């Protein structure tokens, strides 16, 4: 029974229930649970995911110790979760020297240079995006952003990772769109993690095996974008190749479509921001010119908008590292096996660092005020050697979509639209109700 | 499915069955399974304990790489087994830096110096041993060695680890003898290791919890022999103290009584060895003199006898290390998570290194022939930084018993006695039928 651990270390925290730990307190969302705990306990506090002790830390210096300085030595790995199957080879799930190998093997794939060659191809789908939107916009009818954005981000990730060029909203039949489209239980495997090994020997996997096979076969026909870069330490393997691609599609799809939805909601409810953004796009790109790599990096306000949205909606919600060994960081003892958690969502809406945390104010990120922003408070992409390897790609992909979408259209709230936007209470950062706006042509 | 692993590495081995792996081949004893595999596959071979791949290695240079050179870096830990509970803190079960701490904290307790202070107290029980034996011997009746030896080794371990002086064969009521005396399922948790975490969260433990409590309480009344040495890196803890003692009693009891039984069986079936041993004891210790520390270390033949018995009956049977990371030792790749196993029993009865391996011949260990004996073939106490920490104590304890027993008695086979001795087919090196001999007074 490890439920005495925090009270044995003098660390405050909500009293756990037996077996359950604190998970019942997730009933309002664990983001709301983190903020509440931050408010009532201060800088450090402990709670239990079933029998798993989790130490929340909010000190910026502690966060850097954990994310940067002591990462290879102590805090290398995320929380084991599963059942996972062959996806244990995925970089985001791999541990210690295996993760190190995959990070070293995958780093050159996510440089500025490979992104600059990807901008022309991902631009092709900005243009389909505008057409499908123009259609759903000419309907005069409120549009579901997650359906045109979910089609776009889909369209992008497949061609950048396998070169397959499809319009998911209009060729909804290509087996590659089919397979890729397919991708309550979480609640249970946190209070019953002793059951993960059972699901593992039963071939049970949270990733649909029905699909996975399709991919490993699609890789072999390509064996003679992301796939080539990997095909072209010790070298990667065939099945390893597939696990990494699967992680990329998940990352490319649900993050991008969700964030874009969040962006457009903020732009619709702040018309002045939307206009100012469009004026910047129109000045850098006269007469609806084609977005390019070098152009995107000149749009400061566009950058300020994405950053402030990511402040309000950091889709990772929490960063986590498992403590591999007894250690004493910044003046407190962390025992082996505790999960150290950085509550980014709560840190991004903390009044200690943010005046009016709940308002959407891109100027917090202006060249004037950006300097006052602590990189271990504001961590939408994490930090240290295990940060979001696709951060530059994600921002380019979102920005290229935003540019082309705003060059052609404006976004107003509908009688439908949920204002204020509410967040889903699940385990993913997404709107409760889908975002829908009036889209007018410029 | 990891059942293709060995055939994927080019490593021969018996074809596994699904889920079961090779465990059905344990039906004749896994010692017999190791010898058979050694005979049909050669120096290296792989098999599966359910889904756990095990690589058997017999090359002396490979064995040293695994046991000595690469121990801290790769092969630090034994196979996880359980459910274990608080006994995960026991040194023999602990892993990586925790094991390192306990090994460093326990090493000074097992020196020559602490043994020399223990010889007088453990001598007191050689004398009870002779009395209870004399009684069971004056019965004229065949004697069950494991009952007088099991009482002695019991009597020794309790006073050397808690100072409690009892005659287990005649004060069979003292709560300390009671509790300590109390200490099919193995078959199941090797083909269902995915069930160990379940038994863990159910407080289920292979070590009777009914007992364990008694001990941790007996430690606190002593908190104000082994216990003091520990009470008297980072310092040890109270519960940690108890887990280590429990390991010592298991080690002190079943190893010593079993080996002594094996010894006396060999001495009874080789009267010339027994006599020659008694002549040595009588010359070093005239007129049934008291065995002492310095005296024991002068009895070369006594030493040769124990060593040859340990060759025939190495109670550990196998040494094991888990491979912590992909490595390539002595010209072959070992993947992470494989259990590397040294089949000591089979290596001790291999004709490559042993002329007439099945005969009991103490002269193999004579100062003449001892030099030709490879320390990575003959490994009754293992090797490297994780070897048997109580080896010197075990040999002294056995030898002091043997000396006093042979000074007073001789041991002949009975109509009962099982000749040839057969080995139990369980998971412990012990006689099938208990050893019983005629014991005559000298
Ligand atoms: C707005 C979009 C995205 C955001 C906000 C985001 C954020 C994050 C965060 C916060 C982490 C954990 C970092 C940490 O623990 O310190 C992470 C990990 C990761 N991200 Fe992203 N991500 C995004 C999109 C992407 C995309 C599009 C890809 C690839 C196509 C990607 C690839 C990864 C990988 C592979 C990891 C695990 C890295 C490792 O363990 O070495 N991400 N991301
Ligand atoms: C004839 C008697 C004994 C024999 C043949 C024996 C043999 C062994 C062997 C073969 C190992 C594993 C070594 C390896 O993996 O390299 C071992 C481990 C160990 N032995 Fe013994 N043993 C005996 C008695 C004892 C006694 C009496 C004690 C203590 C009271 C003891 C304490 C230990 C411990 C604590 C370990 C685990 C060490 C670690 O993991 O650091 N042994 N023993």
Kindly list the residues from chain A whose CB atom is less than 8 angstroms away from the CB atom of residue B198.
194-195, 198
Helix or strand holding residue B245 (H, E): helix B238-250
- Does the distance separating the beta carbons of B197 and A197 come in below 8 Å? yes
DSSP 8-state class, residue B420: S
Closest CA–CA distance from residue A422 to any residue of chain B (Å):
38
Q: State the Cα–Cα distance between residues A297 and A299, nearest whole angstrom.
A: 6
Question: In terms of C-beta density within 10 A (0-12 exposed, 13-18 middle, 19 or more buried), how is residue B15 classed?
Answer: exposed
Residue B45 phi, psi (nearest 5): -165, 155
The ligand 1 atom nearest the CA atom of A314: 5
Beta strands at B52-57 and B44-49: parallel, antiparallel or unpaired: antiparallel
Residue that is written with structure tokens 């110096």 in the block: B113
Alpha carbon A36 to chain centroid, angstroms: 23
Q: Nominal resolution in Å?
A: 2.1
Alpha-carbon torsion angle A263, A268, A273, A275, nearest 10:
120
Q: State the Cα–Cα distance between residues B385 and B368, nearest whole angstrom.
A: 28
Kindly list the residues from chain B whose CB atom is less than 8 angstroms away from the CB atom of residue A234.
326
B329: helix, strand or coil: strand
Closest CA–CA distance from residue A198 to any residue of chain B (Å):
6
Chain B positions with Cβ closer than 8 Å to A: 19, 51, 96-98, 193-195, 197-198, 200-201, 234, 325-326, 336
Q: State the Cα–Cα distance between residues B288 and B283, nearest whole angstrom.
A: 10
Residue nearest to atom 10 of ligand 2 (CA): B381
CA neighbours within 13 Å on the CB side: how many for A161? 28
Q: Is the dihedral of CA B27, B29, B35, B37 positive or negative?
A: positive
Residue B234 and residue B165 in contact, taking contact as beta carbons nearer than 8 Å: no
Residue A364 and residue A373 in contact, taking contact as beta carbons nearer than 8 Å: yes
- Does the distance separating the beta carbons of A201 and B51 come in below 8 Å? yes
Beta strands at A339-342 and A52-57: parallel, antiparallel or unpaired: parallel
- Does the distance separating the beta carbons of A96 and B51 come in below 8 Å? no
Residue B52 and residue B190 in contact, taking contact as beta carbons nearer than 8 Å: yes
Residue A127 and residue A400 in contact, taking contact as beta carbons nearer than 8 Å: no
Kindly list the residues from chain A whose CB atom is less than 8 angstroms away from the CB atom of residue B201.
19, 51, 194
CA neighbours within 13 Å on the CB side: how many for B21? 24
Angle between helices A175-182 and A209-222 (to 10 degrees): 140
- Does the distance separating the beta carbons of B195 and A201 come in below 8 Å? no
Between chain A and chain B, the number of residue pairs with CB atoms below 8 A apart is 30
Residue A47 and residue A56 in contact, taking contact as beta carbons nearer than 8 Å: yes
Residue nearest to atom 42 of ligand 2 (CA): B390
Of B318, B315, B284, nearest to B302 by C-alpha is B284
Helix or strand holding residue B53 (H, E): strand B52-57
Ligand 1 touching residue A362 (CB < 6 A): no
Q: Is the dihedral of CA A222, A223, A226, A229 positive or negative?
A: negative
Q: State the Cα–Cα distance between residues A104 and B262, nearest whole angstrom.
A: 56
- Does the distance separating the beta carbons of A336 and B98 come in below 8 Å? yes
Q: State the Cα–Cα distance between residues A432 and A412, nearest whole angstrom.
A: 19
Residue A332 phi, psi (nearest 5): -150, 145
Kindly list the residues from chain A whose CB atom is less than 8 angstroms away from the CB atom of residue B50.
none
Task: Locate the DSSP E strands across B358-417.
Answer: 409-413
Say how many C-beta atoms besides its own lie within 10 A of residue B107's C-beta: 10
- Does the distance separating the beta carbons of A326 and B51 come in below 8 Å? no
For A306-326, letters b (16+ CB in 10 Å) and e give bbbbbbbbbbbbbbbbbbbeb
Q: State the Cα–Cα distance between residues B414 and B439, nearest whole angstrom.
A: 9
Residue B152 and residue B401 in contact, taking contact as beta carbons nearer than 8 Å: yes
The nearest alpha carbon in chain A to B2 belongs to A201
- Does the distance separating the beta carbons of B198 and A98 come in below 8 Å? no
Q: State the Cα–Cα distance between residues A367 and A25, nearest whole angstrom.
A: 39
B368: helix, strand or coil: coil
Ligand 1 touching residue A105 (CB < 6 A): no
Residue A336 and residue A323 in contact, taking contact as beta carbons nearer than 8 Å: yes
Q: State the Cα–Cα distance between residues B247 and A417, nearest whole angstrom.
A: 67
Residue A394 and residue A388 in contact, taking contact as beta carbons nearer than 8 Å: yes
Say how many C-beta atoms besides its own lie within 10 A of residue A258's C-beta: 23
B347: helix, strand or coil: helix
Give the residues across from A49 on adjacent strands: A21, A52
Distances (CA, A) of A348 to A55, A281, A308, A366: 18, 27, 10, 17
Nearest to B200 among A97, A194, A195 (CB): A194
Q: State the Cα–Cα distance between residues A345 and A379, nearest whole angstrom.
A: 9
Residue partners of B108: CB distance under 8 A and separation at least 6: B114, B229
Residue A339 phi, psi (nearest 5): -90, 120
Tokens of A74: 């102590």
Residue partners of A214: CB distance under 8 A and separation at least 6: A175, A179
Ligand 1 touching residue A381 (CB < 6 A): yes
Distances (CA, A) of A226 to A160, A183, A219: 6, 19, 11
Alpha carbon A216 to chain centroid, angstroms: 25
Residue partners of B117: CB distance under 8 A and separation at least 6: none
Q: Is B388 annotated as a binding residue?
A: yes
Ligand 1 touching residue A305 (CB < 6 A): no
Q: State the Cα–Cα distance between residues B92 and A231, nearest whole angstrom.
A: 45
The ligand 2 atom nearest the CA atom of B226: 30
Kindly list the residues from chain B whose CB atom is less than 8 angstroms away from the CB atom of residue A198.
194-195, 198
Say how many C-beta atoms besides its own lie within 10 A of residue A133's C-beta: 23
- Ligand 1 centroid, distance to A25 Cα (angstroms): 27
Residue A382 and residue A73 in contact, taking contact as beta carbons nearer than 8 Å: no
Kindly list the residues from chain B whose CB atom is less than 8 angstroms away from the CB atom of residue A197.
193-195, 197
Please tell me chain B's helix, strand, coil percentages from 3-state DSSP, rounded to the nearest 5. Answer: 55, 10, 35
Residue B144 and residue B436 in contact, taking contact as beta carbons nearer than 8 Å: yes
Tokens of A221: 């026909």
Tally of residues, chain A: 442
Of A235, A54, A265, nearest to A144 by C-alpha is A265
Experimental method: X-ray
Residue partners of A131: CB distance under 8 A and separation at least 6: none
Ligand 1 touching residue A343 (CB < 6 A): no
Of A402, A408, A412, A399, nearest to A439 by C-alpha is A412
Nearest to A194 among B19, B97, B198 (CB): B198
Beta strands at A436-441 and A143-144: parallel, antiparallel or unpaired: antiparallel
Residue partners of A404: CB distance under 8 A and separation at least 6: A123, A126, A127, A129, A130, A291
| String of DSSP letters for B99-141 | HHHHHHHHGGGGSHHHHHHHHHHHHHHHHHHHHHHHHHHHTTS
Nearest to A97 among B200, B234, B325 (CB): B325
Beta strands at B339-342 and B44-49: parallel, antiparallel or unpaired: unpaired
- Does the distance separating the beta carbons of A194 and B336 come in below 8 Å? no
Q: State the Cα–Cα distance between residues A251 and A232, nearest whole angstrom.
A: 22
Tokens of B407: 């000074």
Nearest to B194 among A19, A51, A197 (CB): A197
Residue nearest to atom 31 of ligand 1 (CA): A390
Residue B103 and residue B380 in contact, taking contact as beta carbons nearer than 8 Å: no
Distances (CA, A) of B335 to A86, A237, B322, B328: 16, 14, 10, 8
Ligand nearest to the CA of A317: 1
Closest CA–CA distance from residue B32 to any residue of chain A (Å):
29
Of A168, A4, A206, A182, nearest to A87 by C-alpha is A206
Ligand 2 touching residue B91 (CB < 6 A): yes
Q: State the Cα–Cα distance between residues B173 and B328, nearest whole angstrom.
A: 56
DSSP 8-state class, residue B77: B
Q: State the Cα–Cα distance between residues B319 and B298, nearest whole angstrom.
A: 30
Q: State the Cα–Cα distance between residues A352 and A366, nearest whole angstrom.
A: 19
Return the ∠ at Cα A162 (arms to A98 and A107), rounded to 5°.
Answer: 35
Question: In terms of C-beta density within 10 A (0-12 exposed, 13-18 middle, 19 or more buried), how is residue A43 classed?
Answer: exposed
- Does the distance separating the beta carbons of A96 and B325 come in below 8 Å? yes
Ligand 2 touching residue B388 (CB < 6 A): yes
Q: State the Cα–Cα distance between residues A49 and B252, nearest whole angstrom.
A: 41
Tokens of A174: 């290509």
DSSP 8-state class, residue B26: G
Architecture of the B4-441 domain: Orthogonal Bundle (1.10)
Tokens of B387: 């070897």
Question: In terms of C-beta density within 10 A (0-12 exposed, 13-18 middle, 19 or more buried), how is residue A236 classed?
Answer: middle
Q: Which residue out of B194, B236, B238, B337 would a mutagenesis test of the A interface target, given it has the greatest number of A Cβ atoms within 10 Å? A: B194
Q: Given its phi and psi angles, is residue A104 left (phi above 0), alpha (psi -120 to 50 degrees) or beta? A: alpha
Alpha carbon B396 to chain centroid, angstroms: 14
Residue partners of A414: CB distance under 8 A and separation at least 6: A142, A436, A437, A438
Residue B48 and residue B17 in contact, taking contact as beta carbons nearer than 8 Å: no
First-to-final CA distance of chain A: 63
B272: helix, strand or coil: helix
Nearest to B194 among A96, A97, A200 (CB): A200
B39: helix, strand or coil: helix
Residue A41 and residue A13 in contact, taking contact as beta carbons nearer than 8 Å: yes
Q: Is the dihedral of CA A437, A35, A351, A372 positive or negative?
A: negative
Alpha carbon B252 to chain centroid, angstroms: 9
Nearest to A51 among B193, B201, B336 (CB): B201
Kindly list the residues from chain B whose CB atom is less than 8 angstroms away from the CB atom of residue A193.
197
Tokens of B200: 């863990």
Residue B122 and residue B160 in contact, taking contact as beta carbons nearer than 8 Å: yes
Tokens of B349: 């009865």
- Does the distance separating the beta carbons of B201 and A336 come in below 8 Å? no
B393: helix, strand or coil: helix
Residue A256 and residue A397 in contact, taking contact as beta carbons nearer than 8 Å: yes
Q: Which contacts qualify for B329-335: CB closer than 8 Å, 24 or more apart?
A: B329/B62, B329/B65, B329/B66, B329/B70, B330/B59, B330/B61, B330/B62, B330/B65, B332/B9, B332/B11, B332/B44, B333/B9, B334/B55, B335/B5, B335/B9
Return the ∠ at Cα A65 (arms to A61 and A67), rounded to 5°.
Answer: 110
First-to-final CA distance of chain B: 63
Beta strands at B339-342 and B52-57: parallel, antiparallel or unpaired: parallel
Alpha-carbon torsion angle B106, B108, B111, B113, nearest 10:
-140
B38: helix, strand or coil: helix
The nearest alpha carbon in chain B to A52 belongs to B201
Return the ∠ at Cα A359 (arms to A354 and A364), rounded to 5°.
Answer: 50
Ligand nearest to the CA of A316: 1
Helix or strand holding residue B403 (H, E): helix B391-408
Residue A360 and residue A312 in contact, taking contact as beta carbons nearer than 8 Å: yes
Residue nearest to atom 18 of ligand 2 (CA): B388
SS3 track for chain A = CCCCHHHHHCCCCCCCECCCECHHHHHHCHHHHHHHHHHHHCCEEEEEECCEEEEEECCHHHHHHHHHHCCCCCCCECCCCCCCHHHHHCCCCCCHHHHHHHHHHHHHHHCHHHHHHHHHHHHHHHHHHHHHHHHHHHCCCCEEHHHHHHHHHHHHHHHHHHCCCCCCCCCCCCHHHHHHHHCCHHHHHHHCHHHHHHHHHCCCCCCCHHHHHHHHHHHHHHCCCHHHHHHCCCCCCHHHHHHHHHHHHHHHHHHHHHHHHHHHHHHHHCHHHHHHHHHHHHHHCCCCCCCCHHHHCCCHHHHHHHHHHHHHCCCCCCEEEECCCCEEECCEEECCCCEEEECHHHHHCCCCCCCCCCCCCHHHHCCCCHHHCCCCCCCCCCCHHHCCCCHHHHHHHHHHHHHHHHHHEEEEECCCCCCCCCECCCCCCCECCCCEEEEEEC
Instruction: Determine the residue of A65, A69, A251 to mutate for testing ligand 1's pocket, defined as the one with the most ligand atoms within 8 A of the Cβ atom.
Output: A251
Residue A313 and residue A259 in contact, taking contact as beta carbons nearer than 8 Å: yes
Residue spans of the domains in chain A: they are: 4-441
Tally of residues, chain B: 442
């Amino acid at each position: 029974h490890s439920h005495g651990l925090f009270k044995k270390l003098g660390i405050p925290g909500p009293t756990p229930l037996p077996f359950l730990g604190n998970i019942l307190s997730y009933h309002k969302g664990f983001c709301m649970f983190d903020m509440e705990c931050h408010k009532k306990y201060g800088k450090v506090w402990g709670f239990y995911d079933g029998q798993q002790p989790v130490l929340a830390i909010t000190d910026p210096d502690m966060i850097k110790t954990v994310l940067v300085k002591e990462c290879y030595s102590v805090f290398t790995n995320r929380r084991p979760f599963g059942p996972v199957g062959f996806m244990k080879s995925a970089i985001s799930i791999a541990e210690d020297e295996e993760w190190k190998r995959l990070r070293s093997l995958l780093s050159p794939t996510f440089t500025s240079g490979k992104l600059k060659e990807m901008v022309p191809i991902i631009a092709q789908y900005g243009d389909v995006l505008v057409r499908n939107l123009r259609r759903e916009a000419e309907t005069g009818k409120p549009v579901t952003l997650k359906d045109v954005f979910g089609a776009y981000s889909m369209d992008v990730i497949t061609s950048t990772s396998f070169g397959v060029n499809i319009d998911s909203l209009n060729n909804p039949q290509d087996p590659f769109v089919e397979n890729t489209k397919k991708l309550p239980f979480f609640l249970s495997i946190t209070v019953f993690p002793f059951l993960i090994p059972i699901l593992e020997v039963l071939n049970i996997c949270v990733f649909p095996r029905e699909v996975t096979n399709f991919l490993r076969k699609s890789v072999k026909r390509m064996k003679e974008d992301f796939l080539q870069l990997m095909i072209d330490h010790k070298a990667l393997s065939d099945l390893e190749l597939v696990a990494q691609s699967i992680i990329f599609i998940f990352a490319g799809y649900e993050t991008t479509s969700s964030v874009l939805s969040f962006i457009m909601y903020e732009l619709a409810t702040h018309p002045d921001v939307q206009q100012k953004l469009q004026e910047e796009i129109d000045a850098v790109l006269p007469n609806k010119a084609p977005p390019t790599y070098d152009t995107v990096l000149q749009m400061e306000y566009l950058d300020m908008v994405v950053n402030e949205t990511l402040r309000l909606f950091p889709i990772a919600m929490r960063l986590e590292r498992v403590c591999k060994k007894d250690v004493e960081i910044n003046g407190m003892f962390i025992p082996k096996g505790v999960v150290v958690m950085i509550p980014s969502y709560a840190l991004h809406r903390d009044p200690k660092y943010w005046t009016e945390p709940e308002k959407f104010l891109p100027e917090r990120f202006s060249k004037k005020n950006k300097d006052n922003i602590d990189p271990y408070i504001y961590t939408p992409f994490g930090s240290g050697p295990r940060n979001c390897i696709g951060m530059r790609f994600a921002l380019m992909n979102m920005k290229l979509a935003l540019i082309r979408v705003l060059q052609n259209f404006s976004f107003k709230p509908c009688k439908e639209t949920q204002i204020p936007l509410k967040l889903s209470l699940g385990g993913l950062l997404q709107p409760e109700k889908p975002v829908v706006l009036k889209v007018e042509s410029r």
